[PDB]
């Protein structure tokens, strides 16, 4: 039974050779969207896929069959929304003809893209018994919107699912769904934003208009963030969804090392390129239970890895001006020392 080991290298090649024949279809299921705190639907590094080695010139009906089987669903009670990267640095689900663009080879539906990520829409697992089917979708008068709730109090995003809705329907007819899915009372006054892309978070002003108008460049996969219109958002440092998405686009992790501690491993803080000295000192101060006026920061020599000039506590710049001398790996870093009393 060692000759069963003439076949480990007979596929360590037979597969290395045929590899050009196959593509990697990376399925994502909607659950992987919960918790995600950034833009778009997930995070390619923290996302987890169900991977499919599928024949480049395979068929799509063949995939749905293989798919339905492997994951355990009815080849007719599910939907494939191929993930699609856009010119604005955003990857969102896009339509697919599950019957017309189904005469084609799998590789070309991918647009010669491998790997090929595809959002897998499944009927809810509860609604299953109910005789629930996955509702019909008119690829011309309906749209699929994804819903995120923003909580200023935690400054976190709570996924709220998706919805088939006709375009003609008006934003006002969507707010009840939002209150509901967010665990909110009905008629709770809400504020709404389309997440267009990083740093762009347009606020949706006129509710009583149809989506087709209410959303600039409406498309399947657009994203509406909503939040309570409550006065206690104003005690939050990022009171609106927009302010969160800004501070997140501007967000940057920085290492801090005590100059006096030799080979100080130091620690990481997450800061914002448009913070100023007070904001940085106040932050890093909290992270060590000591007064900010007790921290002496040093600029960056940018060449030697040792602290540069002492940073006067009246520094008129921003955190960015201090960090512009860094590159990739060079793990953006400054030096401090604790002061007496």
């Amino acid at each position: 039974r060692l000759q069963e080991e003439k076949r480990i290298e007979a596929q360590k090649r037979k597969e290395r050779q045929e590899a050009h024949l196959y593509m990697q279809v990376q399925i994502v299921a909607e659950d992987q969207f919960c918790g995600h705190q950034g833009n778009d639907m997930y995070d390619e590094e923290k996302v987890k896929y169900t991977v499919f080695k599928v024949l480049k010139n395979s068929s799509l009906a063949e995939f749905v069959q293989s798919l339905s089987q492997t994951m355990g669903f009815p080849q007719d009670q599910i939907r494939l929304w191929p993930m699609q990267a856009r010119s604005n640095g955003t990857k969102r689900p896009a339509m697919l003809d599950n019957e017309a663009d189904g005469n084609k080879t799998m590789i070309e539906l991918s647009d010669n893209e491998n790997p090929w990520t595809i959002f897998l829409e499944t009927v809810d697992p509860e609604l299953a018994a109910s005789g629930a089917t996955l509702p019909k979708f008119d690829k011309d008068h309906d749209v699929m919107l994804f819903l995120k709730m923003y909580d200023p109090k935690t400054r976190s995003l709570n996924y709220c699912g998706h919805i088939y809705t006709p375009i003609s329907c008006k934003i006002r007819d969507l707010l009840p769904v939002m209150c509901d899915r967010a665990g909110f009372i009905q008629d709770t006054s809400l504020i709404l934003y389309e997440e267009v892309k990083p740093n762009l978070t347009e606020r949706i002003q006129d509710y009583d208009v149809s989506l087709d108008k209410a959303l600039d460049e409406l498309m399947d996969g657009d994203i509406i963030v909503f939040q309570k219109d409550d006065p206690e958002n104003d005690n939050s440092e990022l009171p609106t969804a927009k302010e969160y998405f800004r501070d997140l686009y501007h967000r940057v992790d920085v290492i801090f090392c005590d100059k006096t501690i030799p080979n100080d491993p130091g620690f990481v803080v997450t800061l914002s390129n448009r913070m100023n000295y007070f904001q940085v000192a106040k932050t890093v101060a909290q992270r060590l239970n000591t007064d900010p006026m007790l921290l002496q920061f040093f600029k960056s020599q940018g060449y030697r890895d040792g602290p540069g000039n002492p940073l006067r506590h009246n520094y008129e710049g921003t955190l960015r001006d201090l960090l512009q001398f860094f590159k990739p790996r060079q793990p953006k870093k400054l030096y401090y020392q604790q002061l007496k009393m």
């Binding site: 010119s87 604005n88 955003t90 375009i167 460049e217 409406l218």
Partner: peptide, 6 residues
């Protein structure tokens, strides 16, 4: 009129 590109 829902679009096709961005």
């Amino acid at each position: 009129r829902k679009k096709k590109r961005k």
